[PDB]
């Protein structure tokens, strides 16, 4: 059967401002099958209380999910999303870049 690898975007809900509460998002999309593993990372370590949306799909039947958590960005702290899927031989890590 067919398999489609996920697209991954890491980004904040509002424009990032140090010391200001915000939301860190990881949006996975365009993947099949629907089994997927998504972690949000703070300085290489897994953030604990990450929420996600309910499974849905686009017109071409491919799935999408949004994982999210509250956070307060600083200058020092690095954030990332780590995604594992059957199409990936190893977990893919996408870094948060506050200009993307």
């Amino acid at each position: 059967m067919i398999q489609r690898t996920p697209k991954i975007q890491v980004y904040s809900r509002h424009p990032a401002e140090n010391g200001k509460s915000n939301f860190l998002n990881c949006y996975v999309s365009g993947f099949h099958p629907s089994d997927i593993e998504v972690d949000l990372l703070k300085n290489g370590e897994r953030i604990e209380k990450v929420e996600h949306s309910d499974l849905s799909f686009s017109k071409d039947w491919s799935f999408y999910l949004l994982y999210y958590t509250e956070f307060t960005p600083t200058e020092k702290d690095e954030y990332a999303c780590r995604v594992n899927h059957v199409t990936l031989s190893q977990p893919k890590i996408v870094k948060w870049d506050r200009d993307m």
Partner: protein
């Protein structure tokens, strides 16, 4: 403007780990308003938008019962499909279904939909006539023959022309504060040098609803379709969406590049340039 209502359903089998998991969500335009997950503690359909909360307890009981019945039929269908495709019982498989209606500004039906997919591939679909089917293969021809015998399309047509349209009109009125408000995008252009010779111009659109939008880069008035990097429109998480488009330009030629923004919330299409 125009509006849509859609119900999405996914069942995923998991041999050796219990019965298939079933998740369904309902949308009006780009606004999630109901959800149901068979793995929840006490599975019921739950509200996800303020304007649906006012529906009575009868609404939720009947909606919950429909969800549960769909979950059971999907389970039988997944068993059936293993036979149609001569498949083992060892692997995980997926059944997807979408149905809904589109209405125009006058609230009149533009068209209805009912489509299925097995393992991410088109399986069977109701045609635009709301009376005939298109089957993808010989397996789905068996389903078509069954559905034709049981007069399924007739009941679907009655739903799509009747309750789907009428209840979508109701939802649009009750949630008119949000459903009938278009939030225009907030836009800006950023500049990131990559070398001495070229730099990246990125055109941003933030905080817009609904999701539909057009972002285009022009060089000297011609579209840079092939050289534009365009990311998928993404949800901010507060109802609004985001998108950007980037182009790599030779240094000193930035002023020849214009970003054009089309959105429903904008009276005029916007033209933006980078400002040092």
């Amino acid at each position: 403007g125009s509006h849509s209502m859609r119900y999405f359903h996914t069942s995923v089998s998991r041999p050796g780990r219990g019965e298939p998991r079933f998740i369904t969500v309902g949308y009006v335009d780009d606004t999630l308003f109901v959800r149901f997950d068979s793995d929840a503690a006490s599975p019921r359909e739950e509200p996800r938008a303020p304007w649906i909360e006012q529906e009575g307890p009868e609404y939720w009981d009947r909606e919950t019962q429909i969800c549960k019945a769909k979950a059971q039929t999907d389970r039988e269908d997944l068993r059936t499909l293993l036979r149609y495709y001569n498949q083992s019982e060892a692997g995980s498989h997926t059944l997807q279904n979408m149905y809904g209606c589109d209405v125009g500004p006058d609230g009149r039906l533009l068209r209805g939909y009912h489509q299925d997919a097995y393992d991410g591939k088109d399986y069977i679909a109701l045609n635009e006539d709301l009376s005939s089917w298109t089957a993808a293969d010989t397996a789905a021809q068996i389903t078509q023959r069954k559905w034709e015998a049981a007069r399924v399309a007739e009941q679907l047509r009655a739903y799509l022309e009747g309750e789907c349209v009428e209840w979508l009109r109701r939802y649009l009125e009750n949630g008119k504060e949000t459903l009938q408000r278009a939030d225009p995008p907030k836009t800006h252009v950023t500049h990131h040098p990559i070398s001495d010779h070229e730099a990246t111009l990125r055109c941003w659109a933030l905080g817009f609803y609904p999701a539909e939008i057009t972002l285009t880069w022009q060089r000297d008035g011609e579209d840079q379709t092939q050289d534009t990097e365009l990311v998928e429109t993404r949800p901010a998480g507060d109802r609004t969406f985001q998108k950007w488009a980037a182009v790599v330009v030779p240094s000193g030629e930035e002023q020849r590049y214009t970003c054009h923004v089309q959105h429903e919330g904008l009276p005029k299409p916007l033209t933006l340039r980078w400002e040092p």
